[PDB]
């Protein structure tokens, strides 16, 4: 049976004290509403109807490439009225699941179990058990089937002791939503059309409402301020970390590990404390990552060690390379197998060939470096004033002496040797040795002012 | 009604295993006793009488500028005897609050609620409820009014089940303190004059003692060793972090955030994990701070991004600047709007003008740099031997080529261009181009020893 | 009475998803089984019989220098059969303690209390109380003496409410082990010879079995996957940190501190958040360590401050030195008293004399530097192509100007001054001043392309 989803995303989020609307704030680097859209897509939703309102232009800007139907709410008349704006697009046959863009951790696993429990022409309601259910609408069963949701203020002494509560998440067929939504009224203290009233309208219509319990309460929690958002963040990180650990990734402290994206991993991977993994990252077998490292959108080959406080982005690193500590790889850095990148070294948009070393106090930008080169301490690739970032091409088996400037555009051919302190502006031929002739003045018996 | 405070601060803190006296150990970068002095000043105390003893010269050295009356205790005869040394300075009218320099987290809010509850000519006692009250003196009420404090060893079976206990914190008028303190005896196992006996002396005198409960038990806890100090530290940091989060600061993980001072903030500020904020820090709107950064005594303008592992002190950073990763700003660094400071760059005591960039492997010290300058990789400002840190003045629209040394004192005027590898010792005029003439020796067919 | 131990270490650890066998995975940088071997050695064990099996060559490789008897298990027939392979080496007199290589946190203190409780010709059994004992074998007493261990599936309604359970850890004399192990059968669902059956065989033989309770449940827990290993890691780190705090080390956040080795410390030591201490480390009095530092196998003298994000290995640092931030000390770095090492500085295998400073953007390798030298920003020690890391010797009171290359092998004698931008290839004599003669071309009125 086909499926579609409706996601409520119109709220201002006043208590975030932000210019962003509520659902654009991120969990693990991704907006809360994108978590729900992605979950709804994993379930196999055919359409996703996004009820939006506050921060409308920002929603459109930030979610421009999402495959959703953009349903604009111009006034807050409650959850039933919100869903009814999407109702004309519901297929009579096809289940509709209702979700909330500010409760982002709802799992596919829980939702497909909710969808399974839905009786034909009925409703499946997601519920949760709280130790202190004060403030939340209680589930009343008769027997095993939900007959009513009794709000805090209406509940008698014994109903107040019901620990099972309403989450707001609900599944029913499209024909049934169209029917019941048109019957919902707003005769209550707030004057709003409540989606909760579909439970009453279903029973009044002799239709079955079945309750399904959530696995974790955190998966129905919403974030109304940054403190609550931070609690959803730590729960989500802990759960990502636990999954990786059971898969065999040795994360030394899972409370000091952050994944903000996707991680593919080999076996015997070791990750020390305070590491941040962003975007799409792939790690081969026996990769070791030291403390403080940040990896964003990188592929790391088998048997690579990354030493402490290295920052890597949009880069490729071949097997058996050694990086760090204090290394920086900027976008376009491609390191071949068995390369060495050391402390206080920045590599931007450059390819470095097999076995080559760049171990100290060096900037290599917009370059090609061949295999088994030795790039000395203090070497800098640079440009003329008014230039447009031109290229430095270094061949195989080249020795570049310490504190040499390579002035692009320039080529240094295979087997060349460049002495320390050189300024290289002209192409260097194959097996050419280039030494700087210094002039010095020596003064004997110069007493220092000490 | 006027107020003054008495703070007990004489203890050795043997179990800290330190040369510092007990109350000088810090919480959030500030001595425990300074927390209490500051709280007492926030309440509006007119005098603060500081009972000190052990580590007397160190207390005087470290707290030299505090507006306190220095009351020296030469011998431990108990809390009543300690307070009585300050008593001659109590005004008959004026409330006196008693506090402890080794219980630093007592809040102004709790204390002004304690002061309000004090009945005329009576005592207001701060109490707290413990789940396991074993060891602590129990509050006995009759009815709603405190009649006695029964110590662990004296309490019958049912009194042992009283969960409400004495904190030691107390408010009464000065006339009443002088009267009752002179009546306190020391006929007990320890032979000391106990402040607790004022509860008995008050009732024996037909005066009312009213109990007021503390909000959090942590706010009456004392630190007798570093393990307890560390627990007070984490409670205090968590509470600072929660406050900032409810104010709209996005702190990605509040368990990995430290504030040791004061933070002023705009809206939409984002702070990643493992950041330390020290002294007085001001952050404009939409400032983003990456992982591992340390900010001490800095002003950061609107829309600044600070990238990972940057350390900044006594500096100003203008709007839309970009700093990091791996940047170091030392005291006197002033960066104008739209500036760029990159990896492995140290700026000390220098002004850098609007739009200028200093992006790699560079030391700029004691300099002025104008607007829209390009300071190349490897550039170093330096001095002659025996010099006294003289100044390097760079004008507007200057290009300084990579790996150039600027030897102070020297001026480089507007629009000058300096080629790579240059040593600049003489002033450079407006629109002057300065290129280094290299001499090189080329040897063809030189076979490397490989 | 003499002692020996038997350690069960043969398991594959399938659920680690590793090429390492189970007990080689580390806690605090040391294999789980080495924790137990070391504990067994601290107890005074005369022999340690190591039952090994899966990953046999790796065990032999990684534990090659351990003083253990290598007892190879070729087939899993249960714990009684495993111990019986070591039994021929038990002395009739001498206690044998049985331990598990995958439960590493068992303390010497608990084990010597277990050994004390052993009645002559009897058994001492280590037990623990669980709140939920489901799955674990219950201890049945009659009275005060263990009569049976009833497994989950065999226990009646009231036995299921026994919270005291079997740990597997056991002490009995060698003669008694030989006797009872030969009597153990395998008529059970799994078909294995169970060590638990010695409790029954002991009583059936009219011998006394006495129960001793473990202090902490974590000290009998085993790690069957990396998630459980990570929980043992955090418990162990917390406990190491608490011990240091009670000894007077100020650890600002004990949840962000890691010790992977041994730490010797003076008094008034301060350690900020996210510090990692590895191998054998010694810290004098009043050492301050800033955030993010990594110290491996180092001696740090009195009154040293290490500033944030410094990485130090196999190094010595004399009293009153200042290191960091962003400093790197590689193996063989020896810094004398009152030295200064600053940001983006790497020191490898070099001695630096009293009062000398190396404060920016510098590599010093394979060198000797004397006392009161000033090593300028950008200075690099380097080698000729084809050389074998030769030495740079700098005497006392030498000034080396910024961005100078020192080309080894070379000597610079006492009191020499070297100007900025110099390439030093020949020895420099006592009180010799060496200045580089630059040739520059100046072009007036050069308009930059802007
Ligand atoms: C952000 O966009 C919206 C979110 C809404 C929203 N978000 C939401 C819904 C449910 C929960 N979760 C719980 O209610 C819950 C949490 C913990 C335990 C048990 C339940 C959290 C956030 N709730 C309601 C209206 C609404 C209010 C209450 C229940 C359902 C729907 N209306 C909303 C309207 C919006 O435009
Ligand atoms: C450091 O200077 C002093 C501190 C003292 C000191 N500190 C203190 C007082 C109270 C508490 N808090 C609690 O007693 C408490 C903690 C948790 C729950 C409930 C209560 C902690 C530290 N207490 C007492 C004497 C003293 C002893 C006990 C109670 C009051 C006063 N005498 C002190 C004398 C000093 O010179
Ligand atoms: C890794 O090498 C081995 C470990 C074993 C091993 N490890 C072990 C033993 C005891 C515990 N601790 C507990 O049983 C426990 C934990 C928490 C609370 C209470 C108890 C953990 C790991 N246990 C057993 C067999 C075995 C199984 C169960 C009990 C004892 C022995 N056979 C083992 C055989 C091996 O070759
Ligand atoms: Mg240089
Ligand atoms: Mg140079």
Strand partners, A210: A124, A145
Give chain A's end-to-end CA distance (angstroms, integer): 90
Handedness of CA A102, A107, A112, A117 (dihedral sign): negative
**Hey, what long-range contacts does B417-423 have (CB within 8 A, 24 or more apart)?**
B417/A385, B417/C446, B417/C448, B420/A380, B420/A382, B420/A405, B420/A407, B420/A423, B420/B376, B421/A405, B421/A423, B422/C438, B422/C440, B423/C420, B423/C421, B423/C436, B423/C438
Least Cα distance to A449 among C436, B383, B15, B166 occurs for B383
SS3 C84: helix
Give the tokens for residue C127: 């037990």
The answer to whether the CB of A139 is under 6 A from ligand 1 is no
- Put simply, whether C415 touches B (Cβ < 8 Å) is no
Give the tokens for residue B78: 């108990």
SS3 C80: helix
The answer to whether the CB of A222 is under 6 A from ligand 1 is yes
Least Cα distance to C294 among C253, C335, C323 occurs for C323
Confirm if A377 and C380 have CB atoms less than 8 A apart: yes
- Put simply, whether A326 touches B (Cβ < 8 Å) is yes
Q: What angle do CA A372, A377, A382 make, to 5 degrees?
A: 90
Burial class (CB in 10 A: 0-12, 13-18, 19+), B94: middle
The answer to whether the CB of C164 is under 6 A from ligand 3 is no
Give the tokens for residue B292: 């591992």
DSSP B110: H
Q: Which residues line ligand 2 (CB under 6 A)?
A: B 8-11, 22-23, 79, 100-103, 128, 136, 165, 167-168, 217, 220-222
Beta-strand ranges (E) seen in B9-137 are 26-27, 30-31, 48-52, 69-72, 95-100, 123-129
Provide the experimental method for this PDB entry.
Answer: X-ray
Indicate the helix (H) or strand (E) that contains B113: helix B108-117
Confirm if C259 and C280 have CB atoms less than 8 A apart: no
Cβ count within 10 A of residue C172:
25
Give chain B's end-to-end CA distance (angstroms, integer): 90
Q: What angle do CA C34, C38, C39 make, to 5 degrees?
A: 115
| A440 contacts C433? CB cut-off 8 A | no
User: What distance in Å separates the CA atoms of residue A309 and residue C309, rounded to the nearest whole number?
Assistant: 8
Least Cα distance to A417 among B449, C216, B121, B425 occurs for B449
Handedness of CA A23, A29, A34, A39 (dihedral sign): negative
Confirm if A393 and A408 have CB atoms less than 8 A apart: no
Burial class (CB in 10 A: 0-12, 13-18, 19+), C153: exposed
Give the tokens for residue A407: 């002035």
* CA torsion, ordered B361, B363, B364, B366, to nearest 10 deg: 170
Please pick, among C54, C62, C81, C360, the residue that the annotation labels catalytic.
C360
Least Cα distance to C369 among C323, C406, C423, C402 occurs for C406
User: What distance in Å separates the CA atoms of residue A422 and residue B22, rounded to the nearest whole number?
Assistant: 60
Least Cα distance to A275 among C298, C229, B256, C307 occurs for B256
- Helix axis angle, A32-42 relative to A108-117, nearest 10°? 50
Indicate the helix (H) or strand (E) that contains A407: strand A405-408
Least Cα distance to B148 among B132, B159, B161, B135 occurs for B159
- Put simply, whether A388 touches C (Cβ < 8 Å) is no
Q: Which residues of A touch B415 (CB under 8 A)?
A: none
Tokens 């069963």 locate to: A141
Q: Which positions ≥6 away from A330 have C-beta within 8 Å?
A: A313, A314, A315, A346, A347, A348, A349
> Three-state secondary structure along B364-409?
EECEEECCCCEECCCCEEEECCCCCCCCEEECCCCEECCCCEEEEC
Least Cα distance to B235 among B215, B255, B261, B251 occurs for B255
Q: B179-204: buried (b, 16+ CB within 10 Å) or exposed (e) per residue?
A: bbbeebeeeeeeebbbbbbbbbbbbe
- Choose, out of B440, B447, B450, the residue to mutate when testing the contact with A (most A CBs < 10 Å): B440
* Structural domains in chain A, sorted by start: 1-224 (3.90.550.10), 225-450 (2.160.10.10)
Return the biggest CA–CA distance within chain C.
110
Does the N-terminal peptide bond of residue C195 adopt cis geometry, omega within 30 degrees of 0?
A: no
Confirm if C344 and C323 have CB atoms less than 8 A apart: no
Resolution value, angstrom units: 2.1
Confirm if A94 and A176 have CB atoms less than 8 A apart: no
User: What distance in Å separates the CA atoms of residue B412 and residue B350, rounded to the nearest whole number?
Assistant: 15
Indicate the helix (H) or strand (E) that contains B306: strand B305-306
**Helix segments in B182-225, DSSP class H:** 197-203
Distances (CA, A) of A147 to A88, A139, A156, A198, B250: 27, 8, 16, 11, 42
SS3 B58: helix
Nearest atom of ligand 2 to the alpha carbon of B51: 36
Confirm if A369 and A340 have CB atoms less than 8 A apart: no
Indicate the helix (H) or strand (E) that contains A232: helix A226-246
| B248 contacts A230? CB cut-off 8 A | no
For chains B and C, what is the number of CB pairs under 8 angstroms?
A: 152
C151 is in an annotated binding site: yes
| Ligand 3 mean position, distance from CA C223 (Å) | 9
How many Å lie between the alpha carbon of A437 and the closest alpha carbon of chain B? 5
- Helix axis angle, B32-42 relative to B108-117, nearest 10°? 50
Burial class (CB in 10 A: 0-12, 13-18, 19+), B283: buried
| C421 contacts B431? CB cut-off 8 A | no
Q: For C326-369, give the DSSP string.
A: SEEE-TT-EE-TT-EEEEEEEEES-EE-TT-EEEEEEEEESEEE
Q: Which residues of C touch B230 (CB under 8 A)?
A: 245, 251-254
Q: What angle do CA A142, A143, A148 make, to 5 degrees?
A: 30
* Closest residue of chain A to C292, computed from CA coordinates: A292
Q: Which ligand has its closest atom nearest to the C-alpha of C54?
A: 3
Tokens 């010695």 locate to: C198
Q: Which positions ≥6 away from A75 have C-beta within 8 Å?
A: none
User: What distance in Å separates the CA atoms of residue A150 and residue C328, rounded to the nearest whole number?
Assistant: 65
Confirm if A164 and A150 have CB atoms less than 8 A apart: no
Confirm if A358 and A376 have CB atoms less than 8 A apart: no
CA nearest ligand 1 atom 29, residue: A168
Distances (CA, A) of C424 to A445, B343, C342: 18, 28, 23
* CA torsion, ordered B157, B162, B165, B170, to nearest 10 deg: -110
> Three-state secondary structure along B245-300?
HHCCCEECCHHHEEEEEEEEECCCCEECCCEEEEEEEEECCCCEECCCCEEEEEEE
Confirm if A116 and A122 have CB atoms less than 8 A apart: no
| B253 contacts A233? CB cut-off 8 A | yes
Confirm if C393 and C411 have CB atoms less than 8 A apart: yes
| Ligand 4 mean position, distance from CA A291 (Å) | 29
User: What distance in Å separates the CA atoms of residue C73 and residue C82, rounded to the nearest whole number?
Assistant: 7
Nearest atom of ligand 3 to the alpha carbon of C76: 36
Give the tokens for residue A426: 């002209």
Confirm if B367 and B394 have CB atoms less than 8 A apart: yes
Confirm if B71 and B87 have CB atoms less than 8 A apart: no
User: What distance in Å separates the CA atoms of residue C313 and residue C297, rounded to the nearest whole number?
Assistant: 6
- Choose, out of C285, C290, C293, C360, the residue to mutate when testing the contact with B (most B CBs < 10 Å): C360
Confirm if B293 and B275 have CB atoms less than 8 A apart: yes
Handedness of CA C153, C155, C156, C157 (dihedral sign): negative
User: What distance in Å separates the CA atoms of residue C249 and residue C242, rounded to the nearest whole number?
Assistant: 9
C342: left (phi over 0), alpha (psi -120 to 50) or beta: beta
- Put simply, whether C140 touches A (Cβ < 8 Å) is no
Least Cα distance to B199 among B211, B217, B186 occurs for B211
> Three-state secondary structure along A306-352?
ECCCCEEEEEEECCCCEECCCEEECCCCEECCCCEEEEEEEEECCEE
User: What distance in Å separates the CA atoms of residue B412 and residue B432, rounded to the nearest whole number?
Assistant: 9
| C420 contacts B432? CB cut-off 8 A | no
Confirm if A265 and A249 have CB atoms less than 8 A apart: yes
| Ligand 2 mean position, distance from CA B11 (Å) | 10
Q: Which residues of B touch A431 (CB under 8 A)?
A: 444-448
User: What distance in Å separates the CA atoms of residue B200 and residue C5, rounded to the nearest whole number?
Assistant: 63
Breaks after residues in chain B, judged by C–N over 2.5 Å: none
* CA torsion, ordered C11, C16, C19, C22, to nearest 10 deg: -30
For chains A and C, what is the number of CB pairs under 8 angstroms?
A: 151
The answer to whether the CB of A84 is under 6 A from ligand 1 is no
Residue A157 phi, psi (nearest 5): -50, -45
Strand partners, C148: C140
* CA torsion, ordered C294, C296, C300, C303, to nearest 10 deg: 20
- C62 catalytic per annotation: no
Least Cα distance to C312 among C287, C285, C277 occurs for C277
**Helix segments in B31-100, DSSP class H:** 32-42, 56-62, 79-84
**Residue B241 CA to its chain's centroid (Å):** 14
| Ligand 4 mean position, distance from CA C340 (Å) | 20
User: What distance in Å separates the CA atoms of residue B324 and residue B311, rounded to the nearest whole number?
Assistant: 9
How many Å lie between the alpha carbon of B397 and the closest alpha carbon of chain C? 9
Q: For A193-228, give the DSSP string.
A: --TTHHHHHHHTTT--EEEEE-S-GGGT---SSHHH
DSSP C18: S
Q: Which positions ≥6 away from A197 have C-beta within 8 Å?
A: A80, A184, A185
């Amino acid at each position: 049976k086909a499926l579609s989803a409706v996601i409520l995303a119109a709220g201002k989020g006043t208590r975030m004290y932000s210019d962003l609307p509520k659902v654009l704030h991120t969990i693990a680097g991704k907006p809360m509403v994108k978590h729900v859209i992605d979950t709804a897509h994993q379930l196999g939703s055919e359409n996703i109807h996004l009820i939006y309102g506050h921060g409308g232009d920002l929603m459109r800007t930030h979610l421009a490439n999402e495959q959703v139907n953009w349903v604009l709410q111009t006034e807050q008349l409650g959850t039933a009225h919100a869903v009814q704006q999407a109702a004309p697009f519901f297929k009579d046959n096809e289940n509709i699941v209702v979700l909330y863009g500010d409760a982002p951790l709802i799992t596919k696993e829980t939702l497909e179990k909710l969808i399974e429990a839905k009786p034909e022409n009925g409703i499946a309601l997601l519920t949760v058990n709280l130790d202190n259910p004060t403030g939340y609408g209680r589930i009343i069963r008769e027997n095993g089937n939900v007959v009513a949701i009794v709000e805090q203020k209406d509940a008698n002494a014994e109903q107040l002791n019901i620990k099972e509560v309403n989450t707001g998440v609900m599944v029913s067929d499209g024909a049934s939503f169209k029917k019941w939504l048109a019957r919902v009224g707003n005769n209550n203290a707030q004057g709003e059309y409540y989606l909760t009233d579909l439970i009453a309208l279903a029973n009044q219509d002799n239709c079955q409402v079945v309750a399904v319990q959530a696995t974790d309460v955190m998966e129905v929690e919403g974030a109304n301020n940054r403190l609550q958002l931070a609690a959803l963040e730590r729960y989500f990180q802990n759960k990502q970390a636990s999954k990786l650990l059971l898969e065999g990734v040795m994360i030394y402290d899972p409370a000091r590990f952050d994944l903000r994206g996707t991680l593919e991993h080999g076996k015997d991977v070791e990750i020390d404390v305070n590491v941040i993994i962003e975007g799409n990252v792939k790690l081969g077998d026996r990769v070791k990552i030291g403390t403080g490292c940040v990896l964003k959108n990188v592929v790391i080959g088998n048997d690579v060690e990354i030493k402490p406080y290295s920052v890597l982005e949009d880069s490729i690193v071949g097997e058996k390379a050694a990086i760090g500590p204090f290394s920086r790889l900027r976008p376009g850095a491609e390191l071949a197998a068995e390369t060495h990148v050391g402390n206080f070294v920045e590599i931007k948009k450059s390819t470095v060939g097999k076995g080559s070393k760049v171990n100290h106090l060096t900037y290599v930008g917009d370059s090609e470096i061949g295999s088994n080169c030795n790039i000395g301490a203090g070497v800098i690739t640079c440009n003329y004033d008014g230039a447009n970032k031109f290229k430095t091409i270094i061949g195989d088996d080249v020795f570049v002496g310490s504190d040499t400037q390579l002035v692009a555009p320039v080529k240094v051919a295979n087997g060349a040797t460049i002495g320390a302190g050189t300024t290289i502006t002209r192409d260097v031929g194959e097996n050419e040795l280039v030494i700087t002739r210094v002039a010095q003045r020596h003064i004997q018996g110069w007493q220092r002012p000490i």
